[PDB]
Design an enzyme around this catalytic site. Structure first.
Site, short mmCIF file in Angstrom:
data_model
loop_
_atom_site.label_atom_id
_atom_site.label_comp_id
_atom_site.label_asym_id
_atom_site.label_seq_id
_atom_site.Cartn_x
_atom_site.Cartn_y
_atom_site.Cartn_z
N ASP A 247 -1.92 -5.34 0.91
CA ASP A 247 -1.32 -4.19 1.57
C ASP A 247 0.09 -4.45 2.07
O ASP A 247 0.96 -3.59 1.94
CB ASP A 247 -2.19 -3.75 2.75
CG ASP A 247 -3.56 -3.28 2.30
OD1 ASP A 247 -3.63 -2.48 1.35
OD2 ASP A 247 -4.57 -3.73 2.90
N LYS B 182 -14.90 -8.77 2.49
CA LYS B 182 -13.56 -8.82 1.91
C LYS B 182 -13.11 -10.25 1.66
O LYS B 182 -12.38 -10.51 0.69
CB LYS B 182 -12.57 -8.10 2.83
N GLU C 67 0.83 -1.20 0.00
CA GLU C 67 0.00 0.00 0.00
C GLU C 67 0.87 1.25 0.00
O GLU C 67 1.96 1.28 0.58
CB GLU C 67 -0.92 -0.01 1.22
CG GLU C 67 -1.90 1.16 1.32
CD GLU C 67 -2.69 1.38 0.05
OE1 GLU C 67 -3.75 0.74 -0.11
OE2 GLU C 67 -2.26 2.21 -0.79
O1 LIG Z 1 -6.20 -1.33 -1.30
C1 LIG Z 1 -7.16 -0.67 -1.42
N1 LIG Z 1 -7.37 0.09 -2.64
C2 LIG Z 1 -6.37 -0.01 -3.69
C3 LIG Z 1 -6.78 0.86 -4.86
C4 LIG Z 1 -7.01 2.32 -4.46
C5 LIG Z 1 -6.22 2.93 -3.49
C6 LIG Z 1 -6.49 4.25 -3.17
N2 LIG Z 1 -7.46 4.92 -3.75
C7 LIG Z 1 -8.23 4.37 -4.68
C8 LIG Z 1 -8.02 3.05 -5.05
C9 LIG Z 1 -8.17 -0.58 -0.28
N3 LIG Z 1 -9.37 0.22 -0.41
C10 LIG Z 1 -10.33 0.30 0.71
C11 LIG Z 1 -11.59 1.14 0.53
C12 LIG Z 1 -12.21 0.64 -0.77
C13 LIG Z 1 -12.85 -0.59 -0.76
C14 LIG Z 1 -13.42 -1.09 -1.92
C15 LIG Z 1 -13.35 -0.38 -3.10
C16 LIG Z 1 -12.70 0.85 -3.12
C17 LIG Z 1 -12.12 1.35 -1.96
C18 LIG Z 1 -11.42 2.71 -2.04
F1 LIG Z 1 -12.01 3.59 -1.19
F2 LIG Z 1 -10.10 2.58 -1.74
F3 LIG Z 1 -11.54 3.19 -3.32
N4 LIG Z 1 -10.09 -0.46 1.97
C19 LIG Z 1 -8.89 -1.26 2.10
O2 LIG Z 1 -8.69 -1.86 3.10
C20 LIG Z 1 -7.91 -1.34 0.97
O3 LIG Z 1 -6.75 -2.11 1.08
MN LIG Z 2 -6.45 -2.85 2.91
MN LIG Z 3 -4.58 -1.75 -0.25
#
Ligand SMILES: O=C(NCCc1ccncc1)c1[nH]c(Cc2ccccc2C(F)(F)F)nc(=O)c1O
Ligand SMILES: [Mn+2]
Ligand SMILES: [Mn+2]
Ligand SMILES: C[C@H](C[C@@H](C[C@H](C[C@@H](C[C@@H](CCN1CCCC1=O)N1CCCC1=O)N1CCCC1=O)N1CCCC1=O)N1CCCC1=O)N1CCCC1=O
Length: 180
Positions: free
Chosen positions: A93, A119, A65
């Site tokens: 991550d 998840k 991440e």
């Molecule tokens: O890895 C991640 N994203 C990776 C791609 C990304 C990263 C940053 N900005 C936009 C894209 C991630 N995203 C989330 C929250 C989420 C959950 C489902 C869909 C979209 C999102 C969000 F908000 F990120 F767009 N929770 C986690 O725990 C996690 O690991």
């Molecule tokens: Mn995550």
């Molecule tokens: Mn992530």
């Protein structure tokens, strides 16, 4: 433009974390000035990941991440071609060199049971470890192997509740929680 959430986010989190969250949201076609709850969420997830890799030994974790999509996938490919681990379908991550497995860190404003169910269905690949924290102070890990020390996890939960209190004292917490 002009949201209290954006200003509080940029104030409550560290400048490097804010910059990384901004680059991520822009990389995924998302505006941190209009999608400000998600701005806060990305910053919180980023800080939790960094704290999580700060626990444990010196060489233990590889942070995935925070990098850009391409370089993160490159490091993932290296991890897989190095250890022989199944290549995860979606970006994790962390990677644990001690337990030899990828780690997916979750931070939710809903019930932890629900979020991990979601998840775990999404990943489906029953190889990647899954660790959820909550703003109420609850956590849940695959097999109930929480990977890190109790003290390191307690630090993260305390930080989460501090963020929640700071949002509530400004009246942005209701919106944040209902935004997920
Ligand atoms: O890895 C991640 N994203 C990776 C791609 C990304 C990263 C940053 N900005 C936009 C894209 C991630 N995203 C989330 C929250 C989420 C959950 C489902 C869909 C979209 C999102 C969000 F908000 F990120 F767009 N929770 C986690 O725990 C996690 O690991
Ligand atoms: Mn995550
Ligand atoms: Mn992530
Ligand atoms: C390595 C570098 C940046 C790291 C980001 C991560 C953040 C770290 C901040 C530092 C200061 N520390 C370390 C001790 C406490 C502290 O405050 N922590 C940890 C706690 C919260 C926090 O904020 N770390 C860890 C190593 C040093 C560093 O900065 N990242 C960003 C994503 C990928 C990555 O490895 N890299 C690598 C190349 C690109 C880049 O930027």
């Amino acid at each position: 433009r002009g949201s209290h959430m954006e200003d509080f986010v940029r104030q409550c989190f560290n400048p490097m974390i804010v910059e990384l969250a901004e680059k991520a949201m822009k990389e995924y076609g998302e505006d941190p000035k209009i999608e400000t709850n998600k701005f806060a969420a990305t910053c919180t997830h980023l800080e939790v990941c960094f704290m999580y890799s700060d626990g444990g030994s010196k060489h233990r974790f590889e942070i995935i991440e925070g990098r850009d999509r391409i370089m993160a996938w490159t490091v993932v490919n290296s991890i897989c071609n190095t250890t022989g681990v199944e290549k995860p379908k979606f970006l994790p991550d962390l990677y644990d060199y001690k337990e030899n497995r990828f780690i997916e860190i979750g931070v939710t404003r809903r019930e932890v049971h629900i979020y991990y169910l979601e998840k775990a269905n999404k990943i489906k690949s029953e190889k990647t470890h899954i660790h959820i924290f909550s703003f109420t102070g609850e956590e849940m890990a695959t097999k109930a192997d929480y990977t890190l020390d109790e003290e390191s996890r307690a630090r993260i939960k305390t930080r989460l509740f501090t963020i929640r209190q700071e949002m509530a004292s400004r009246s942005l917490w209701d919106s944040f929680r209902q935004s997920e």
